[PDB]
């Protein structure tokens, strides 16, 4: 089962960890609907940058 | 207390010997009787043990607590040790000054064949 | 000396402050071979209760889910400067 993630904020004034985490999720620009395989890890990544992403 | 002073006097040898990981021959002396036991490098399990408290050795001797009795144990332990397969060991004097009974025990252990 | 009290479900820093900023405050009941019981209760009652010296000595019967549990106040946390309670430890 896959989960659709969407970037909902800019990655400008953000920590290197958070800039990395979006590269790990595969989100490039704001409003980028990327779907990933649901695991304990990806939910951790989404948890790490929850403020700037939205799950479907 | 005397005992406690003898334990900490021995400890340095023991702790140095367990670090090397060698099979030690502990020798506990007493006013009446002299004990000896070969203990495995791990420290827990005993491989060979003999003393003048054992009737097999006590029946033979005149008195259990002297140089000639210590030699009889020192022979006995080393006589068993070779049957078990043991040969290279160390000698833990165990806080007793290497001089009399323990020296007799050690010399008897050497002369019996236990190469250490 | 009888107070109605609800059972807690969320418990931590976040819940307890939400609770404590809603005219209520957390307490706990424990004692005997039974398990402890986390107990949410109203502030404005228990604030008026403690003015009497009997409260910190006599036996109180706390009403939870119908069941009335007999206890004594073993420990209590005052708010640092404001005159108000933060938490009560009820021994059984």
């Amino acid at each position: 089962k896959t989960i659709k993630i969407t970037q909902t904020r800019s990655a400008i004034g953000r920590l290197p960890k958070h800039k990395a985490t979006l590269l790990g999720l595969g989100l490039r620009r704001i409003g980028h609907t990327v779907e990933r395989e649901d695991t304990p890890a990806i939910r951790g990544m989404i948890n790490a940058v929850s403020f700037m992403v939205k799950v479907e | 207390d005397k005992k406690s002073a003898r334990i900490r006097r021995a400890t340095r040898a023991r702790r140095k010997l367990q670090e090397l990981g060698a099979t030690r021959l502990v020798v506990h002396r007493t006013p009446r009787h002299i004990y000896a036991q070969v203990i495995a490098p791990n420290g827990s399990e005993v491989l060979v043990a003999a003393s003048t408290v054992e009737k097999a050795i006590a029946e033979q001797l005149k008195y259990t607590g002297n140089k000639d009795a210590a030699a009889a144990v020192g022979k006995a332990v080393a006589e068993r040790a070779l049957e078990k397969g043991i040969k290279d060991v160390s000698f833990d004097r165990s806080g007793f000054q290497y001089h009399g009974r323990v020296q007799a025990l050690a010399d008897a252990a050497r002369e019996a064949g236990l190469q250490f | 000396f009888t107070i109605n009290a609800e059972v807690r479900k969320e418990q931590g820093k976040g819940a307890s402050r939400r609770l404590r900023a809603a005219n209520k405050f957390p307490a706990i009941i424990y004692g005997g071979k039974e398990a402890p019981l986390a107990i949410e209760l109203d502030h404005d009652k228990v604030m008026n209760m403690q003015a009497k010296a009997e409260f910190y000595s006599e036996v109180l019967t706390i009403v939870v889910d119908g069941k009335e549990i007999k206890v004594k106040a073993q420990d209590v946390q005052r708010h640092p400067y404001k005159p108000k309670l933060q938490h009560i430890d009820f021994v059984r």
Binding site: - | - | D75, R78, P80, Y81
Partner: protein, 136 residues
């Protein structure tokens, strides 16, 4: 004027006066002056507020001082440039977090214990309140 009789070090860092106080309960005496506010009390302020209580309640009653300075405050002389060393210790302060009981009274009426603490509170910088020795 209260001050430590000898100390390990003459000068101390500035630090930060954060968190809540620890001497919150009215321990010894019946009544007490609790600090609502946050700040720092100089050695002079404490003595000034002590004199204002002591003289209000007369010879009768007993007073405790729960706060003690033990924190030296340095100050640089007038018309001196920055650097060239840490300044010289002028006065001593006690850091006061919210909740700290400053003073405690005993052996006086409740109505006349309050009137004394108002006069003390008037000397102090920190916003204060009256507290009674409750049970538990």
């Amino acid at each position: 004027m209260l001050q430590p009789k000898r100390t390990k070090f003459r000068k101390m860092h500035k630090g930060r006066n954060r968190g809540l106080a620890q001497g919150t309960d009215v321990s010894f005496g019946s009544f007490g002056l609790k600090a609502v506010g946050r700040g720092r009390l100089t050695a002079r302020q404490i003595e000034a507020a002590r004199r204002a209580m002591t003289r209000a309640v007369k010879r009768q009653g007993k007073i405790w001082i729960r706060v003690f300075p033990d924190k030296p405050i340095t100050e640089k002389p007038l018309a001196v440039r920055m650097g060239k060393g840490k300044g010289n210790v002028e006065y001593w302060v006690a850091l006061i977090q919210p909740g700290k009981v400053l003073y405690e009274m005993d052996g006086v009426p409740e109505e006349l214990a309050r009137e004394a603490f108002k006069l003390a509170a008037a000397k102090l910088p920190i916003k204060t309140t009256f507290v009674t020795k409750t049970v538990m």
